[PDB]
Amino acid sequence: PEMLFSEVDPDFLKSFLLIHESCKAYGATPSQYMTFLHVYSAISSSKKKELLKRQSHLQAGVSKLNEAKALVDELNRKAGEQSVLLETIKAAEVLINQLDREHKRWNAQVVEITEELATLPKRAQLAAAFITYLSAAPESLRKTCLEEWTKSAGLEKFDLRRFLCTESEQLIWKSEGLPSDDLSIENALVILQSRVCPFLIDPSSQATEWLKTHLKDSR
Amino acid sequence: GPRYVVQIGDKIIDYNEEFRLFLSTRNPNPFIPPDAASIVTEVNFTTTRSGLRGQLLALTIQHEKPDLEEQKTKLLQQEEDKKIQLAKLEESLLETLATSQGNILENKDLIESLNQTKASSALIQESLKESYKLQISLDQERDAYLPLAESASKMYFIISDLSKINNMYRFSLAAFLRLFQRALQNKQDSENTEQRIQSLISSLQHMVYEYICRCLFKADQLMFALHFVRGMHPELFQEN
Amino acid sequence: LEVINQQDSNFITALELAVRFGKTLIIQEMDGVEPVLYPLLRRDLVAQ
C-alpha cells in the first residue's frame, strides 16, 4: 500500500496486515488482497469528490444567504433616507418566512461534512473489507467480524449500510421486488463491486428477478 | 491499434468497453474450484431467521383479516411515496440558494422558493401526523400473530439439519409454505383469537410431524422426535 | 496525415496504421497500381 500510496501512516499499514492475518482462516488469496486495495482506492476517491461537492454547494448557499441579508438590511433604509431628505419589504419578509427554517436547516452540514471527511479512510477500509471478503459467510460470521473490526477501529457506533446507501435508494429497490431483510439488502450492496464478476447463489429466483428488473435501462 | 481483442475459443473478438457480465446459480454447491474462486466474488442469497419471521408474520396478517393487510400496505406505500416526493421538493433548496447567486432579492425565484418551502413544511407536518396515525394503528393489529410465527420459524430450522446423518433428508421451503397454507385452509377455528393462536400452533405441530414421518426410515423416528422436542421447548431440560 | 514513399521499408506497416487509425494518406513515388491495393481501392468490407 505504500507503493499504492503516492501512486497517521504506519497505523493504517499495520492495520491492513492484521486484518489480512485474521482473515487467512477462511481462504485468503492475494488476488483478494489486491481487489481489496483497488476497491478501497475507488470508493475513497468517489466519496471524497462527493463530500467536496456537498461542501461547495453548502458554502455557496451560506455565501448567497448572507449577501442577500446584508443587501436587504439597508435597502429599505436607503429608500427611507431618500424619503427623509425629500417596495420589497413584503417579499423580503415572505422570503424570511421560508428562510427561518431554510438557513437553519442548511447551516449545520458545513461543520458536519467538515468533521466527517476526517473519518473517511477507516470507513472506506471497513466498506472495502466487507465487499472483498464477507459476501460468502453466514450472517453470524458477518456480525462477529464486523463487531471485531468495529472495536478494532474504536468507533463502536457508525454503521455502514447507511454510510454507503441512503433511504431513497432502499425504498426504490424495495419498490421492485428486492427482499427486505438485512441479508438481501447487504447482498444487493455488494454488487456495487465491478472489479470482479458477482456470483449469485440463489435458491429462489427473486433477487435475480430484481436485478434484471432494475437493469432494464441499459442493453 | 487503439482497441483490444480477447480470446473466446478460436475466434478473435473486439472487447467493447460497455461489457458487464452477471450470472445466476440455483444450487449453492455445485461448483467452484480453488482457481476460479479467487477471481469471482460469490454472493449467497439465503433465508435467515429474522427475515423468515417477518415473512410468516405477513402471511398470518394476510390470513387473519384482509382489511388490516390492505391498510398496512396502502399506508406504507403512501408513506414511501411521500418520502420520495419530500426529498424531491427539498432537492430544489440548492437551486433556491445558489442557482445563479445574484439578484436573489430582486427576481421572483425567491418568491417561488417561499411557495416551495410552504409545500415542504405542509408535507412534513402531514407526514408527522401520518406516521403518528399508523404506528399504534398497525401495532395492535399486527402484533396478534407473532407468537405463532416465532415457533413456526423455529420448526424449519429444526427440520433443516436432518440431512446430516442420512442423505435424501433434504427438505424444501416451497412445500413448507404450502404446509403453512394448509394450516389455515383446513382449520376453520372460531373462538377468541388469543384462544386461536395456541389452537393453530397445536394443529400445525401435528401436520409437520406427520409430513416428516411420511419420509423417514423406521429406525430414525425416535431421533426425529427427541430432536424435535429439544427444538420446540428448550426449557424443560435445564442445564448440563 | 501521414505521407509515405513507394520504395520505402515500412510501407505495409504504416499502411496498416493508416487503415486502422483513420488517417488521411498521401503516397509519393507511385510507379503504377500496386497489387496490394486492389480491395482497398474497391469496396471489400466484410462485417463483424
C-alpha atoms less than 13 angstroms from C-alpha of A107 in its C-beta half-sphere:
8
For A164, other C-beta atoms within 10 Å of its C-beta total: 18
Query: Could you tell me the CA-to-CA distances from B129 to A104, B83, B135, C34 in Å, in that order?
Result: 23, 13, 10, 86
Using the Cβ of A176 and the Cβ atoms of chain B, whether some distance falls under 8 Å is answered with no
Count other C-beta atoms under 10 Å from residue B163's C-beta: 12
Separation of alpha carbons B57 and B146, rounded Å: 6
Q: Which residues of B touch C48 (CB under 8 A)?
A: 14
Whether the bond into B30 is cis, omega within 30 of 0: yes
Nearest to A200 by CA among B114, B22, B102, B96: B22
- For residue B3, which amino acid is it? R
How many Cβ atoms are within 10 Å of A169's Cβ, its own excluded? 11
**What angle (nearest 5°) sits at the alpha carbon of residue C15, between those of residues C10 and C18?**
125
3-state helix, strand, coil in chain C (%, to 5): 30, 10, 60
Residue A28 touches partner B, C-beta closer than 8 Å: no
Q: What does the alpha-carbon distance between residue B183 and residue B199 come to, in Å, rounded to a whole number? A: 11
CA-CA-CA-CA dihedral for A31, A32, A38, A43, to nearest 10: 160
C-alpha cell at B167: 442423505
- Check CB contact under 8 Å for A194 and B21: no
- Chain C positions touching B2 (Cβ under 8 A) are 20-21
Query: If you count DSSP H runs as helices and E runs as strands, how many of each does chain C have, helices first?
Result: 2, 2
Beta bridge partners of B13: B6
Beta strand pairing status for B23-25 and B11-14? unpaired
> Closest Cα to residue B92, out of A61, A172, A104, A114?
A61
**Cα-based angle A202, A203, A204 (whole degrees, multiple of 5):** 95
Q: What are the cell numbers at C7?
A: 520504395
Tell me the three state secondary structure of residue B17. Answer: coil
Question: What residues contact residue B81 under an 8 Å CB cut-off, 6+ apart?
Answer: none
Residues A15, A155, A112: CA angle, nearest 5 degrees: 115
Question: CA angle, corner B164, sides to B160 and B168, nearest 5?
Answer: 80
